[PDB]
Amino acid sequence: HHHHPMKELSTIQKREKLNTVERIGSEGPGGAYHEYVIKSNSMDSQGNYDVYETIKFQKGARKEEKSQHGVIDSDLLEIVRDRLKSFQAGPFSSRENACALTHVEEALMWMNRRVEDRIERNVLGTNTK
Amino acid sequence: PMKELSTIQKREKLNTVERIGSEGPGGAYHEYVIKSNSMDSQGNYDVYETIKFQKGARKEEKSQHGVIDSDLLEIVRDRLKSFQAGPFSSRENACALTHVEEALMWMNRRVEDRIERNVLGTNTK
Numbered sequence: 001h002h003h004h005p006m007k008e009l010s011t012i013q014k015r016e017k018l019n020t021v022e023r024i025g026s027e028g029p030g031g032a033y034h035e036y037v038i039k040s041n042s043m044d045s046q047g048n049y050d051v052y053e054t055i056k057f058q059k060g061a062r063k064e065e066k067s068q069h070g071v072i073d074s075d076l077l078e079i080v081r082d083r084l085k086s087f088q089a090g091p092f093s094s095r096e097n098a099c100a101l102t103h104v105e106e107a108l109m110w111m112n113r114r115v116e117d118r119i120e121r122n123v124l125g126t127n128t129k
Numbered sequence: 130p131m132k133e134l135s136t137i138q139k140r141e142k143l144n145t146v147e148r149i150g151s152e153g154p155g156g157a158y159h160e161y162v163i164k165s166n167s168m169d170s171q172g173n174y175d176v177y178e179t180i181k182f183q184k185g186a187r188k189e190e191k192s193q194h195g196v197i198d199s200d201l202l203e204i205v206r207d208r209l210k211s212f213q214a215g216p217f218s219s220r221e222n223a224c225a226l227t228h229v230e231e232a233l234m235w236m237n238r239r240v241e242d243r244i245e246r247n248v249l250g251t252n253t254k
C-alpha cells in the first residue's frame with residue numbers, strides 16, 4: 001500500500017543492504033523514537049515496496065500513565081537469537097554467526113540485568129534513572 | 130502449540146515471543162509473533178505483532194520478501210543510543226549497546242565474506 005534524509009538510520013552494513021530502516025515520528029519518552037519502518041530497497045512493478053513493515057515500541061512505562069502498548073527491545077533480540085541458534089544447528093553455520101549470537105545473548109543478558117536492577121530499586125516502569 | 134521462546138529474561142516480561150510456521154531454509158523459522166502477557170477488558174491481547182523474515186535468498190526464484198536480522202538489531206541500536214543520550218541512561222544499556230553493535234559488526238562480516246566468496250544470495254555455506 002506504500003509507494004516508493006535525517007530519518008533513515010546509518011547502519012553498520014554498508015554494501016548490499018536488503019532494506020532501509022527509518023525512524024517514524026518524534027522523540028518520545030527517554031528521548032527515544034518508538035516507531036520504526038523497515039522497507040525494501042526493491043520496487044514492485046508499479047513502484048510499491050516489496051517490504052514495508054512497522055515496529056511500534058511500548059511507549060510510556062508500565063507503571064506510568066497513558067501508555068501505548070507494544071514491543072520491547074529484548075523481544076527483537078530474542079527473535080534474532082532464535083534464528084541464529086537455528087542457522088547454527090543447520091547446514092549453513094559459520095563462525096561469524098556464532099560470534100554474533102554470543103554477542104546477542106550477552107546484550108540480552110545486560111538488558112535483563114537492567115530489568116532486575118530496576119526491580120530491586122523498585123523503579124521498574126517509572127520515569128526514573 | 131506453544132512454540133514459545135525460552136527467553137533470557139525471566140521476570141516481569143511484558144511480552145511472549147512465538148515462532149510461527151515450520152522450519153525453512155537453513156533450518157530457521159521466518160515468521161514470529163510478539164504477544165502481550167496483558168489483555169484488554171474483553172480478553173484480547175494488548176499487543177499482537179508479526180515479523181516476517183526474508184525467506185529464501187534474494188537471488189533465487191520463488192522467495193518471500195521480508196525483514197533481515199540486521200534491521201532488528203539496527204533499530205535496537207538506535208534506541209539504546211537515544212536512551213543513552215537521554216535522561217534515563219545506564220551502564221547496563223551501554224554494555225548492551227556495545228554488544229549489539231559488535232553483533233551487528235559480526236553480521237556484516239558474514240555478508241562481506243559471502244560477497245567475497247560471491248555466494249551472497251545463494252544457498253551455500
Ligand SMILES: Nc1ncnc2c1ncn2[C@@H]1O[C@@H]2COP(=O)(O)OP(=O)(O)OC[C@H]3O[C@@H](O[C@H]2[C@H]1O)[C@H](O)[C@@H]3O
Nearest residue numbers: 029030057058059060061062123124125126127212217
Ligand atoms: N533499555 C531501555 N528500555 C526501555 N526504556 C528505557 C531503556 N533505557 C532507558 N529507558 C527509559 O527509561 C524509562 C523506564 O523504562 P522501564 O521502567 O524499564 O520501562 P518498561 O516498563 O519496560 O516500559 C518501556 C517503555 O518505558 C518508557 O520509559 C523508559 C525510557 O524513558 C519508554 O518509553 C519505553 O519504551
Ligand SMILES: Nc1ncnc2c1ncn2[C@@H]1O[C@@H]2COP(=O)(O)OP(=O)(O)OC[C@H]3O[C@@H](O[C@H]2[C@H]1O)[C@H](O)[C@@H]3O
Nearest residue numbers: 087092097154155182183184185186187248249250251
Ligand atoms: N545469519 C544469517 N542470516 C541469514 N541467513 C543465514 C544466516 N546464517 C545462515 N543463513 C542461511 O544462509 C542462507 C543464505 O543467506 P544469504 O546468502 O546471506 O542472504 P539473503 O540473500 O539475504 O537471504 C536471506 C534468507 O536466505 C535464506 O537462506 C540463508 C540461510 O539458509 C534464509 O531463509 C534467509 O532468511
